[PDB]
Amino acid sequence: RISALPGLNNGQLAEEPLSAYVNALHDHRLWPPFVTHLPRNMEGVQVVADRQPLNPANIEARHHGVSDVPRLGAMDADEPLFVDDYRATDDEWTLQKV
Amino acid sequence: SLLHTFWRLPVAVFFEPHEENVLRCPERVLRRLLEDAAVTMRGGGWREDVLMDRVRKRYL
Amino acid sequence: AVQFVGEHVKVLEVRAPLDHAQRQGLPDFISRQHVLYNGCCVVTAPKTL
Amino acid sequence: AARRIPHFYRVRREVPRTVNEMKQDFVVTDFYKVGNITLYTELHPFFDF
């Protein structure tokens, strides 16, 4: 609550708020160092694992309940990056950073 | 003398108005989507029955 | 609880350009975080692992 | 309206704040400066304009 300026953040530059400018704890680019789910808005972000970026949704998937072999045969790989099927909202993102 | 940023005018290709610049309409799809609305908004819903049925409802 | 197995640890480098209020100082700037994925904030020496 | 409250938020266009909300984001010593906007509205201690 102290990190943002709650009496002042009402207005937009981009779709990010004023609070994502007055303090780097509230924007969607400063990633917390131990993430469990990927965030919701990655407009000005591109995440890399190999030499190339991982922008399109062709290298993201999640199935628990079907117990498939090509995930569990490439657990220590660099391509697939089996994300959770639950994106993180603004509150869980900034509180993870906190 | 490096890569600085100044106030250029915002260039945007536009069109000044004329007398024969027409906005063409898709006939065979959008007029045929307007057809069913035109034939269904003739019969009924004249907005002359709601307050008159209310002032008849208070009577009866 | 072995219903929800995740993959191994893989360090995610994030190439995230800055916002559009500090962009004009070197507009070819990018940042580089090193956020880890599938891990834990370990604080002790795990004596069995 | 008791059912149309979720039908109001189904558009995604922001509502601008009014002048009374524009008058509370100032400290007590910055109200009397030219950077303030609403000095052409604060005309009476009994009435809002």
Binding site: D50, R51, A77, D78 | L2, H4 | K10, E13, L26 | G35
Partner: peptide, 29 residues
């Protein structure tokens, strides 16, 4: 400080290009 708003947020304070001129891998593994 709010008098100096006509000074602090001009773009010439945030341009290090003449300052820069005068001053002078696979993550999978």
């Amino acid at each position: 400080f709010v008098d100096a708003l006509k000074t602090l947020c001009h773009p010439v304070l945030h341009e290090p290009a003449p300052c820069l001129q005068t001053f002078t891998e696979p993550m999978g593994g």
